[PDB]
Structure formats: structure tokens, C-alpha cells
Amino acid sequence: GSHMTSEQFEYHLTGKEILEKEFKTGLRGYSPEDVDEFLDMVIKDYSTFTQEIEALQAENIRLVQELDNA
Amino acid sequence: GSHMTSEQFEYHLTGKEILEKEFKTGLRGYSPEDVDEFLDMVIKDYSTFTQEIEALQAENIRLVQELDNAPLR
Numbered sequence A: 001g002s003h004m005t006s007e008q009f010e011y012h013l014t015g016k017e018i019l020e021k022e023f024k025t026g027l028r029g030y031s032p033e034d035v036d037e038f039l040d041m042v043i044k045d046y047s048t049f050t051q052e053i054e055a056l057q058a059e060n061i062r063l064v065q066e067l068d069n070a
Numbered sequence B: 001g002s003h004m005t006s007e008q009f010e011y012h013l014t015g016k017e018i019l020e021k022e023f024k025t026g027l028r029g030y031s032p033e034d035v036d037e038f039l040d041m042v043i044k045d046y047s048t049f050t051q052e053i054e055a056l057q058a059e060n061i062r063l064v065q066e067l068d069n070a071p072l073r
């Protein structure tokens, strides 16, 4: 009967891991303030990506469950 | 036939921007090698997130098309 495919998405980091990452420092290096400001945006985007996927999964569930009554 | 729209989510960066970003240097900054290796994972994750979202959006559009044509009662 009905057969679903299965796809897997592999991620390297979590927002938490980015929040908790401590870079080593050296004689010359990237401006800590500038890197921090940039990663702040990255962490926000990880949260937003996660939320949008959750929203899209819920929308998927909504549509599938409607079709349950077809 | 009638439609409404929303703008639910706000993003700050693209993967391309993270690949291309050039940081100012200074005394006692973060290890460039360490930061670059870290951001490489971020870049790959942005691409994967983006792919997953676009795949779900395509799937949902297929399902809405199916539902448009489906009798329920």
C-alpha cells in the first residue's frame, strides 16, 4: 500500500553550542567584539530556522490530517 | 478566489554572507583558524536548514493542491 519516502537532514551545531563556544585567543586575531556581534545574529537565525521548520511541520500535519477525511 | 498574506519570520544573514565575512583584526583577537573552522559548520548548517524548509514548502503546496480537489463530506 501507501509508501512514504524518508529524508534525513544532518546538522553540525545547535544554537546552544554556538552560545557556549569559547574561542582561543592569539597575538593577532579577529576582533572579539565583531565576531560576537556576528554570532549573535547566527544564533538568532538558528532559532528562527528551527521555529520555521516547526511551523512548516505543523502545517504539514494540518493538511495531512484534513486529507484523512477524504 | 481570495488570498491573505503574512510575514512570520525574520532572518539576519545568508550562508554566502557568512562565507564571505571579513573580520577586523586586533591584538589578542580570536584565533582566525578556530573561528573559520567554526563558521564552516554554520555555513553548512544554513544550507541544510534552507534545503529542509524549501522541501517542506514544496510538499505542503502539493498537499494543498490535493486538498483543493478532494471531497470531504
Ligand code: NI
Binding pocket: A001, A002, A003
Ligand atoms: Ni505498498
